């Protein structure tokens, strides 16, 4: 077999120059799950410049300067997290791939998280003044509680442990942004910024698959390690999740200070922390009280919550 006596170019480039390189094979696929994911993310391609945000002006203009500034800051916070995952996180996954197709899928993830970041710019272009936009960038730079979150994950992307890099890569789309995503869903339950909410539902339709895929690939690799080193990786996951829940709770308490959302937003955050754990193959230890949010807000996320005959 050509495959078993050759390496992928990225394997050749970073890990093993001793063998010759093989072209990607899309006709003989090691894992069919890669084709499912590839087909879905590529057919789900979208641009925010194709959603009309200008219909949010009537509801946006009725919000006082307090709420407008909160939306601009929150979204500018999410833009930073997407910028991290697009420029660092997702491209770092490529070289640590189990399969050839996984390399290409993480190139798609990087690009699409880049489109997520860009989508906030198009919202701002239509809704926000130059001043509101520039104030949010200053606030994001000078907010240590905000900065601490990305600062905790980035070292795992640049270090030489691929499984900790993978867990970080799964933690971003799986948990870190939901505290912020609470806000647009909160407003769209009250009939405010409904078009903006459509961009968020498109972002999350991408995020859900990013989280699933990174968690699925994490599980394939840990299964090959001994029971002792498997328990050690589980320890690191919960230790990291504990630290990131701590940093997120701090951040959200400051972000939502005066608006009285923090509690609900943190519960939404932990609902998704539970989902992050399930996507890595661990049970959710979170109670119904810790993870409950108002139905009207949850309905904005999902309203649902060959044949012979």
């Amino acid at each position: 077999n050509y495959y078993d006596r050759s390496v992928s170019p990225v394997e050749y480039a970073y890990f093993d120059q001793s063998q010759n390189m093989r072209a990607i094979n899309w006709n003989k696929i090691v894992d069919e799950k890669d084709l499912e994911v590839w087909n879905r993310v590529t057919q789900n391609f979208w641009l925010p410049e194709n959603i009309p945000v200008s219909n949010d002006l009537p509801s946006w203009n009725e919000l006082d300067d307090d709420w407008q500034q909160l939306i601009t800051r929150t979204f500018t916070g999410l833009t930073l997290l997407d910028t991290v995952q697009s420029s660092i996180g997702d491209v770092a996954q490529i070289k640590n791939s189990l399969t050839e197709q996984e390399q290409v899928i993480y190139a798609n993830f990087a690009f699409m998280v880049g489109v997520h970041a860009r989508s906030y710019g198009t919202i701002f272009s239509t809704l926000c003044t130059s001043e509101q936009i520039e104030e949010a960038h200053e606030w994001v730079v000078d907010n240590e509680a905000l900065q601490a979150r990305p600062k905790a994950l980035i070292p795992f992307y640049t270090a030489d442990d691929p499984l900790k890099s993978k867990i970080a890569a799964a933690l971003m789309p799986g948990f870190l942004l939901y505290g912020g995503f609470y806000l647009p869903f909160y407003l769209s339950a009250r009939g405010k910024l409904p078009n903006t909410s459509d961009i968020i539902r498109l972002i999350l339709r991408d995020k859900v698959i990013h989280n699933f895929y990174s968690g699925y690939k994490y599980q394939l690799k840990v299964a090959k390690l001994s029971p002792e080193k498997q328990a050690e990786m589980k320890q690191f996951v919960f230790d990291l999740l504990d630290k990131m829940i701590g940093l997120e709770k701090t951040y959200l308490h400051q972000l939502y200070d005066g608006f009285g959302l923090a509690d609900e937003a943190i519960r939404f955050s932990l609902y998704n922390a539970g989902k992050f754990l399930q996507n890595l193959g661990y049970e959710s230890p979170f109670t119904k009280e810790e993870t409950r949010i108002a139905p009207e807000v949850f309905a904005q996320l999902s309203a649902r919550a060959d044949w012979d005959f």
Binding site: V208, S284, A305, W307
Partner: protein, 126 residues
């Protein structure tokens, strides 16, 4: 006499949920070259991929001998799909004319296991 028929892809989320339940379970094969025959009544538990119903589950239910024994459906997925969350359950409900009993996420929570165990007991006595 409580029986589950389930489908699960290579990711095994639905498989792992079903193993946490009390009721005996039979797996629909991933390999489309393979089929099963079920001769007892069962609750169907399937994930969603939107073609919302996995092709292997359509093949299973396309056998009149198999689909006559369905006592209802439970469907899984992820709420991040919005209007598409767990729509395999509804689609199967409409085709078979059987009740949609429950909806859940990934490998299920502690709550989901308690409710499905109860709903399977109450479905086989009703």
């Amino acid at each position: 006499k409580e029986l589950i028929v389930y489908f699960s892809t290579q990711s095994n989320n639905t498989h792992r949920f079903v193993q946490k339940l009390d009721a005996e379970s039979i797996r629909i094969p991933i390999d489309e070259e393979e089929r099963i025959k079920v001769d007892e009544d069962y609750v169907l538990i399937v994930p969603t991929y939107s073609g919302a119903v996995p092709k292997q589950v359509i093949h299973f239910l396309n056998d009149p001998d198999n689909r006559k024994h369905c006592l209802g459906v439970i469907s899984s997925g992820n709420t991040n799909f919005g209007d598409s969350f767990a729509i395999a359950g509804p689609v199967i409900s409409y085709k078979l004319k059987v009740p949609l009993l429950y909806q859940f996420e990934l490998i299920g929570t502690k709550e989901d296991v308690e409710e499905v165990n109860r709903i399977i007991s109450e479905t086989f006595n009703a």
